Write a protein that binds this ligand. Structure first.
Ligand SMILES: *Cc1c(COP(=O)(O)O)cnc(C)c1O
Ligand SMILES: *Cc1c(COP(=O)(O)O)cnc(C)c1O
Lengths: 282, 282
């Protein structure tokens, strides 16, 4: 039940022995991709979608995953079994590998790490969070790279300023995403708005959009002007750990009374239904 | 003489045992800074300047280096001594450390790695290299972060296209630097031009500028338009390993007959003199 093992390059290894040699290009060059997904009732959620993303991220960095997707899926199931857990967080990392020259990739290092189910997962607080705008555009935004400098560097500024997250705004004209979350507005006519370009295409994002459309809501995937914050009734984040999370304040703009909006609340319940349905196919 | 040891968190460690645990934020989040400098005759070159840069990079990521600069300088000298080498490459890495939550830094991991003197160091080929333009702007450009995704990802494209390096061009309007080098033009009136903003402030760059000014050349530190490639007689790179390196072709623009330009050649000899002078102070 406590996590006893990780997997490095297809070998189960006690957590206390899970190391990389310092020639690894993630350490020297931040060259890497990753994926992160929850497991509930002994099943990684929406697994084929997270794995297909992981394979697409690897090909963008010209990094070959040593195992095909069936073989990686087996190793993930074997690791859940070996740690004897049903509720977990799971991280896949694929690094540039042990490079001869501290720059050119050779063969990648593959890591499968495992965590308790995050405590906050799908908390679904009724009180929206408070975030700040930050001018920035992520590099290679469509690839899930290991590159979180700006997001991490900003943690002092976020806290200093009374916030618990931020939203990136490309040349401070275009709303994108947080470091770790996709961003949605709900207009007063109940139209759901989210960025279509220069973002990471979240799996959670995909499930909430599909669930919104199935419930008969209008969803626009489009460029979002900074000024549309002024027109929106609601704002929320999506991610693997957040599920759907109500944002109550961006800078001095309070959405409603700061509590979770109507459509936001309906989208939380639909996401929990997307998960329940997923688990019934396993 | 072969490298026997690295230093991790103030402890000398055999190279074969130099590892980090996979919770290190450089591995999970590419959160890190580094520095790299040569040693000749048993002395790291321009050391105080590289160390002051290393300390400035750390403070930008809010990462405290555990030792003051005198103590780090001692550890570097002790490591050269223990490996019994006079000619070396030296890498300092400071990672986000072993984070509890795979995101928030706690205390950093400090690495001192050591290499043979790179074979190519200050090669000073008379034949200029061939590079391509690439549209891109480095994140946090003034900090020497471990984030080289774009530069590394581009290696296939560079080689495919008949090149051995690139030059980054900010919104393809403004000339900046390569992934690993500063970039200079020499105008037909012998004015030396280099970017002043949104670049890493190289140590080599600093020494070549000082040496050019002392020789009585005009040096402009200014924004450089893409179209000024058309006006330049010469182009060169600077970096710790290149020293000064002649660029003979950018895309279909051949500088002269592709061989090292006049001022470029004089700046190579002045840099070797900057190094010789440095070593006489040790
Ligand atoms: C991981 C990540 C997300 C969330 O994607 P999910 O698949 O929903 O967890 C969003 N944006 C960025 C930048 C991310 O790295
Ligand atoms: C390290 C580096 C340089 C070169 O700096 P030097 O101190 O001259 O080696 C140039 N540009 C970038 C982006 C670098 O990381």
């Amino acid at each position: 039940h406590m996590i006893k093992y990780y997997n490095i390059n297809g070998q189960q290894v006690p957590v206390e022995n899970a190391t990389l040699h310092v020639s690894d290009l993630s350490i020297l060059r931040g060259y890497g991709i990753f994926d992160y997904f929850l497991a509930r009732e002994g099943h990684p959620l929406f697994l084929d979608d997270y794995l297909n993303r992981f394979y697409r991220s690897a090909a963008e960095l010209y990094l070959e995953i040593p195992f095909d997707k069936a073989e990686l899926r087996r190793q993930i199931y074997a690791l859940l079994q070996a740690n004897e857990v049903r509720e977990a967080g799971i991280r896949l990392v694929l690094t540039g590998g042990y490079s001869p020259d501290g720059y050119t990739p050779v063969n990648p290092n593959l890591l499968i790490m495992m965590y308790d189910l995050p405590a906050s997962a799908w908390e679904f607080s009724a009180q929206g969070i408070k975030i700040i705008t930050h001018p920035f555009q992520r590099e290679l935004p469509e690839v899930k790279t290991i590159n979180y400098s700006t997001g991490i560097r900003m943690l002092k500024t976020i806290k200093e300023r009374g916030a618990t997250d931020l939203i990136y705004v490309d040349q401070g004209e275009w709303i994108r995403e947080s470091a770790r979350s996709n961003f949605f507005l709900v207009m007063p006519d109940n139209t759901i708005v989210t960025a279509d370009e220069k973002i990471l295409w979240g799996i959670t994002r995909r499930q909430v959009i599909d669930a919104a459309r199935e419930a008969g809501y209008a969803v626009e995937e489009r460029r979002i002007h900074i000024t549309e914050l002024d027109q929106a009734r609601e704002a929320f984040f999506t991610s693997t750990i957040k599920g759907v999370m109500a944002i109550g304040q961006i800078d001095d703009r309070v959405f409603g009374d700061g509590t979770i909006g109507k459509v936001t609340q309906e989208l939380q319940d639909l996401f929990v239904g997307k998960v329940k349905a997923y688990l019934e196919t396993c």
